[PDB]
Amino acid sequence: RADEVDYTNLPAPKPQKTVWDDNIETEVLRKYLDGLSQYDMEEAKYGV
Amino acid sequence: DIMVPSFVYNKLPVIHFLQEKRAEQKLRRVLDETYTEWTEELDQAHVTDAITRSLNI
């Protein structure tokens, strides 16, 4: 009868960086879309 | 009638040469003071970001 499981362990939510379609509207907006992706990843890591 | 006229005649070539150089000097200085001036305008991405924030997104 050895250790079974660490019930106080949660697999961290593996985030995924949103990928935008490559058009002119993305090249013009590249900085803004990158900021949105960074904000999304930060929210996913922290929780909200 | 004779003396001063001859010495004025002798002066003409050098004065003409020096004044041509002076005129070229003025033109050269006029060109040298010209320099394309590029202006910088607020990037529209910050406008697009403030637009998004105002939406409460």
UniProtKB/TrEMBL annotation, chain A:
Signal peptide: none annotated. It is found in: Membrane. It comes from the Eukaryota. Belongs to the ATPase delta chain family. This is Uncharacterized protein. It comes from Trypanosoma brucei brucei (strain 927/4 GUTat10.1). The chain holds residues 208 to 255 of 255 of the full protein.
From TrEMBL, chain B:
GO terms for cellular component: kinetoplast; mitochondrion. The keyword Membrane applies. Keywords: Membrane, Transmembrane, Transmembrane helix. This is Uncharacterized protein. The gene is Tb04.26G5.190.
